[PDB]
Amino acid sequence: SRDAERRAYQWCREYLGGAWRRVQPEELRVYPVNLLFRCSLPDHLPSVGEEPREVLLRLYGAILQGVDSLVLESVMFAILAERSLGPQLYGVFPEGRLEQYIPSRPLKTQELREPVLSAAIATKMAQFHGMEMPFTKEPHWLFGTMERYLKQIQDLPPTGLPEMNLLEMYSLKDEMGNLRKLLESTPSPVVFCHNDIQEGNILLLSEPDSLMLVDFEYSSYNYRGFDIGNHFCEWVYDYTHEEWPFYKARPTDYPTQEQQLHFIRHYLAEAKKGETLSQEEQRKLEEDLLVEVSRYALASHFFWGLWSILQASMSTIEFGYLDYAQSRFQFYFQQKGQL
Amino acid sequence: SRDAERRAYQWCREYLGGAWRRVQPEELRVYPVNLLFRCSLPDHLPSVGEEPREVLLRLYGAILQGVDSLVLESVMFAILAERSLGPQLYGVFPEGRLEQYIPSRPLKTQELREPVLSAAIATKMAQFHGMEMPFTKEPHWLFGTMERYLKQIQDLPPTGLPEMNLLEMYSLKDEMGNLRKLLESTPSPVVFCHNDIQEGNILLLSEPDSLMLVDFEYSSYNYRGFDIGNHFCEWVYDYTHEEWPFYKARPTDYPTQEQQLHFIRHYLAEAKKGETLSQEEQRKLEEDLLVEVSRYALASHFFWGLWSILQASMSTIEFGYLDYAQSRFQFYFQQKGQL
Ligand SMILES: C[N+](C)(CCOP(=O)(O)O)CC(=O)c1ccc(-c2ccc([C@]3(O)C[N+](C)(C)CCO3)cc2)cc1
Ligand SMILES: C[N+](C)(CCOP(=O)(O)O)CC(=O)c1ccc(-c2ccc([C@]3(O)C[N+](C)(C)CCO3)cc2)cc1
Ligand SMILES: Nc1ncnc2c1ncn2[C@@H]1O[C@H](COP(=O)(O)OP(=O)(O)O)[C@@H](O)[C@H]1O
Ligand SMILES: Nc1ncnc2c1ncn2[C@@H]1O[C@H](COP(=O)(O)OP(=O)(O)O)[C@@H](O)[C@H]1O
Numbered sequence: 301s302r303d304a305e306r307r308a309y310q311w312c313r314e315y316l317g318g319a320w321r322r323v324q325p326e327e328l329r330v331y332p333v334n335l336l337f338r339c340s341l342p343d344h345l346p347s348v349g350e351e352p353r354e355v356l357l358r359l360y361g362a363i364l365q366g367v368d369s370l371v372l373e374s375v376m377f378a379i380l381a382e383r384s385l386g387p388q389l390y391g392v393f394p395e396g397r398l399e400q401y402i403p404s405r406p407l408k409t410q411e412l413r414e415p416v417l418s419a420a421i422a423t424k425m426a427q428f429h430g431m432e433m434p435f436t437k438e439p440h441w442l443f444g445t446m447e448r449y450l451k452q453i454q455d456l457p458p459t460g461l462p463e464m465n466l467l468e469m470y471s472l473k474d475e476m477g478n479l480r481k482l483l484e485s486t487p488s489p490v491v492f493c494h495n496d497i498q499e500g501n502i503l504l505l506s507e508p509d510s511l512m513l514v515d516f517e518y519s520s521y522n523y524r525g526f527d528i529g530n531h532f533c534e535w536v537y538d539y540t541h542e543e544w545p546f547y548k549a550r551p552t553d554y555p556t557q558e559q560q561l562h563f564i565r566h567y568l569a570e571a572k573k574g575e576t577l578s579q580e581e582q583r584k585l586e587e588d589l590l591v592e593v594s595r596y597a598l599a600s601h602f603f604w605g606l607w608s609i610l611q612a613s614m615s616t617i618e619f620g621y622l623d624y625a626q627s628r629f630q631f632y633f634q635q636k637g638q639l
Numbered sequence: 640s641r642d643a644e645r646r647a648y649q650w651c652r653e654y655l656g657g658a659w660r661r662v663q664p665e666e667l668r669v670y671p672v673n674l675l676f677r678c679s680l681p682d683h684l685p686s687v688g689e690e691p692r693e694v695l696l697r698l699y700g701a702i703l704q705g706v707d708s709l710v711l712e713s714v715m716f717a718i719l720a721e722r723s724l725g726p727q728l729y730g731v732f733p734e735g736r737l738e739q740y741i742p743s744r745p746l747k748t749q750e751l752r753e754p755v756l757s758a759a760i761a762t763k764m765a766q767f768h769g770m771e772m773p774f775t776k777e778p779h780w781l782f783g784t785m786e787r788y789l790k791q792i793q794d795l796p797p798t799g800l801p802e803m804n805l806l807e808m809y810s811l812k813d814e815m816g817n818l819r820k821l822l823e824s825t826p827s828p829v830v831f832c833h834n835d836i837q838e839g840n841i842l843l844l845s846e847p848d849s850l851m852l853v854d855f856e857y858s859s860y861n862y863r864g865f866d867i868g869n870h871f872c873e874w875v876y877d878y879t880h881e882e883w884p885f886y887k888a889r890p891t892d893y894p895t896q897e898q899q900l901h902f903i904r905h906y907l908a909e910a911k912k913g914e915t916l917s918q919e920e921q922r923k924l925e926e927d928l929l930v931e932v933s934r935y936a937l938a939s940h941f942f943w944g945l946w947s948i949l950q951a952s953m954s955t956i957e958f959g960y961l962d963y964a965q966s967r968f969q970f971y972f973q974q975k976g977q978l
């Protein structure tokens with residue numbers, strides 16, 4: 301649309317500067333990749349200084365985001381950029397931001413299991429967990445957010461859908477306490493977590509450090525075990541499935557013990573790189589982490605199942621959110637019973 | 640106060656973590672340095688990881704700051720920290736932030752003229768001007784802000800003070816156009832400027848890179864000439880004077896031509912360090928910059944004079960804001976006439 305093109309043009313010229321000052325309106329169009337758009341400097345123009353030739357314009361939702369929330373999100377994004385753990389940040393303004401376009405493609409679900417890529421993901425996740433960030437270090441995110449989601453679900457206006465509420469079908473309010481008790485018995489260090497290391501958020505670089513993570517919507521200080529366990533759960537789900545419900549679950553694609561240990565070995569090699577450990581101490585760290593993840597992986601099911609019920613309340617036919625929620629809760633109980 | 644101590648305690652434990660988790664309330668008190676407070680970890684405690692032992696708690700005003708303004712301020716502060724151009728950032732929360740306490744003292748007015756310190760200030764200012772920041776690069780800050788201040792002054796409710804309005808005494812609305820025309824004829828590159836490089840914002844490090852700038856309240860993309868000229872104006876004003884109006888002006892302390900060239904040589908040595916320039920090209924850059932600064936220094940007087948009238952509207956006997964404004968406008972006209 302004429303207005304959207306004009307805004308993108310103005311934002312690029314004003315926030316990027318340099319060669320962008322010489323671009324004429326008729327030479328620039330936005331390409332949707334929807335709230336995300338690619339903007340490219342015309343080929344005939346040389347760059348002036350270090351200003352980027354390739355950016356992504358990210359527009360914020362029509363949805364209300366609090367002031368404090370936007371401060372935290374923007375500060376987080378800016379810091380991860382400086383530390384080379386996310387895309388560079390080139391503009392912040394009320395409507396959105398301009399980010400580095402990373403030449404890349406996202407991973408696919410099946411690629412997560414390839415040993416060399418899985419080792420690289422482990423290494424990157426551990427790098428992320430090494431970050432000191434200016435946010436609360438108290439680990440209230442996991443159960444605080446789940447408690448909030450449950451309250452929000454309880455408060456939803458009735459819609460007319462006749463089915464038993466999933467909170468009741470799966471006794472989720474009671475079950476949350478059972479999970480809390482289990483995880484309270486399971487030590488897991490509190491670290492800066494990504495919280496959504498799915499294939500769609502892992503970019504395979506065309507100009508390799510071979511990967512970059514994106515999508516920090518959910519990132520927070522949280523239990524290490526959640527970030528790893530959540531990643532393992534993602535081996536099961538493909539969100540590119542082309543028929544309703546527009547995801548597919550393959551439960552047998554959950555990582556085997558050997559696949560989990562391979563990831564864990566590479567994770568710990570990075571996490572513990574500055575430490576002098578015997579092979580025996582290393583073995584213990586690996587075994588303990590295997591158990592830790594087996595339990596915190598259950599929180600991935602529980603968290604996303606609750607989140608998905610809320611998504612269903614704002615959706616119709618574009619994705620089977622309620623179906624997905626039920627899949628996560630079924631796997632929760634199955635895996636809980638296999639402990 | 641009990642409440643303020645408790646809040647500081649909670650913020651330190653929650654945002655700093657590490658050894659701060661082991662601190663007991665009775666071991667921590669805040670020291671005012673008022674919205675700024677020092678918090679120190681007890682001496683008996685060893686640090687756990689990289690968490691700071693010495694922080695400054697900065698509380699935000701009771702005064703309204705917009706959402707977008709707080710995003711920009713916080714992002715700016717976080718980026719300058721990463722680039723080692725400001726204090727590290729350890730917590731952001733609705734009420735304020737936790738920053739690195741920099742072991743240091745501020746410079747004094749008379750120290751600005753010492754050649755070795757002035758060379759270091761020039762070098763640091765040029766470093767700051769090298770920054771690419773995710774903010775508007777269009778140079779509307781100077782006249783946009785002055786136009787806004789003038790409008791705000793025009794809109795002030797009458798107070799009962801009988802004196803001629805300084806806007807009228809000095810014909811400032813007309814004079815702003817005269818200044819704009821002068822500066823429009825004076826090329827000055829647009830760079831990321833500090834905008835308030837006064838002695839009180841230059842910290843002399845106890846653990847030396849010998850200086851750190853602080854106070855980014857006014858920082859923005861702006862004309863280089865303003866940042867340098869503003870700094871030179873600051874050689875004249877001491878804000879520690881102990882009798883009303885609580886500043887002192889020493890007009891003869893404005894830098895001589897030689898003092899200005901000394902600063903300029905060191906500024907350009909840093910700004911142009913990656914460039915192959917002849918001694919002749921270097922001489923021209925120095926001479927041109929001398930003229931540039933002579934003109935943009937006038938904007939320092941004009942800007943702060945307007946700002947000071949606004950400060951007077953919220954002040955009584957703590958500082959002679961209106962007196963200060965008049966001093967800046969008198970010097971503006973004197974120096975304009977000496978061009
Ligand atoms: C577990 N998970 C990590 C939760 C957080 O998700 P995000 O990382 O925020 O996406 C992923 C997840 O639950 C998820 C991921 C993707 C989708 C999704 C995928 C595709 C669509 C779709 O509208 C489906 N379509 C058939 C209409 C084609 C265009 O894309 C809509 C939703 C829905 C749910
Ligand atoms: C030109 N300048 C760089 C403008 C921006 O100032 P800031 O860097 O934001 O301070 C500095 C400036 O105009 C200025 C600087 C300092 C002061 C100031 C200095 C001292 C006080 C005072 O309340 C005075 N006191 C006698 C009551 C003792 C305690 O401190 C109050 C105000 C007033 C004005
Ligand atoms: N900085 C970037 N560079 C290149 N591609 C990106 C970038 N950020 C996101 N993408 C692409 O856009 C997709 C969605 O972006 P993301 O930040 O994950 O937002 P969301 O998943 O909330 O829509 C990613 O899967 C990736 O393909
Ligand atoms: N990070 C810091 N470390 C040590 N001292 C600081 C720090 N920040 C500010 N100060 C001290 O506090 C004073 C005021 O802080 P500043 O950030 O300039 O705020 P303002 O001038 O708006 O009150 C400085 O002159 C300096 O003496």
Ligand SMILES: [Mg+2]
Binds near residue numbers: 500514
């Ligand atoms: Mg994503």
Ligand SMILES: [Mg+2]
Binds near residue numbers: 839840853854
């Ligand atoms: Mg200051």
